[PDB]
Amino acid sequence: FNLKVVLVSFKQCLTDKGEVLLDHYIAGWKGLVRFLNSLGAVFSFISKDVVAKLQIMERLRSSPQSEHYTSLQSMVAYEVSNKLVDMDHPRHPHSGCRTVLRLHRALHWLQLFLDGLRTSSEDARTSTLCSEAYNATLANYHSWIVRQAVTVAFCALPSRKVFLEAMNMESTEQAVEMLGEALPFIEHVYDISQKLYAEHSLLDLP
C-alpha cells in the first residue's frame, strides 16, 4: 500500500466528458481513510464519518438503481428528477446528493492539507498546516465547539517527516514529487464536483 496508488483513483475517475465516476471516487476515499488511520487517532472525527458515508454510497451503487449512481452527474440528475433529495429545512436523510456533499467538503480539506504538507519547509509545523487547511474548508460547516476542540487536537499531530513517510514512497523527496503529480487530479475532481453542486443549488443540502 502507498499513497501514489491511492491518489491515482482520482485521475482514473475522470471521463473525457468531465464526469466524475462514483466507483473510483469511493476507492480514492477508501485509500485516504487508510492513510489517515496510519497516523493515529487525531483524524477519527473525520475518518469514522467518511467511512460511514462511503458505506452509504456503496449500498446505493450496488442497489437495483446501480445504473443511476454511475457518476456524480448521473446521481444528481436521477436523485433530483425523482425528488429523492431534501433541498430545504426531511424525508431522505441518506441521499447520494447530501452524502457526497460531506465527502466533497472533507475532500477539499484533505486536498489543501496535503498541498500544504508538500510546499512547506522541512520541519514545518503539522498542526499549523492542518489548521490553515481546516479553517479554509471544513470549519465553515462545523460549530464553535467543534472548531475549538479540533484546532487543539491538531497539536497532537506527527511531524512532517512521519507524514511523508506514511505515504510509503521510496523516499521523502519522492513522496513530495508524487504529491505534485497527484493533487491536480484531486483538485480537478473537486472543481468539477463543486461546480456541479453549485449549478444545481446543492451546496447546502441538509
Determined by which method? X-ray
- State the binding site: 49, 53, 98, 102, 142
Rounded Cα distance, 41 and 58, in Å: 25
Reading the block at residue 198, the C-alpha cell is 453549485
**What is 1-206's CATH number, 1.25.40.10, 1.10.3520.10, 3.40.1710.10, 3.20.20.120?**
1.10.3520.10
* Resolution of the experimental structure, in angstroms: 2.5
Neighbours of 169 (CB within 10 A): 18
List residues forming the annotated binding site for an N-acylsphingoid base 1-phosphate: 49, 53, 98, 102, 142
- Give the CA-trace dihedral at 66, 68, 70, 76, to 10 degrees: -140
Distances (CA, A) of 49 to 41, 43, 56, 192: 13, 10, 11, 23
Domain ranges of the chain: 1-206
Instruction: Let me know how long the chain is.
Output: 206
Output the nine-digit C-alpha cell for 197: 453542486
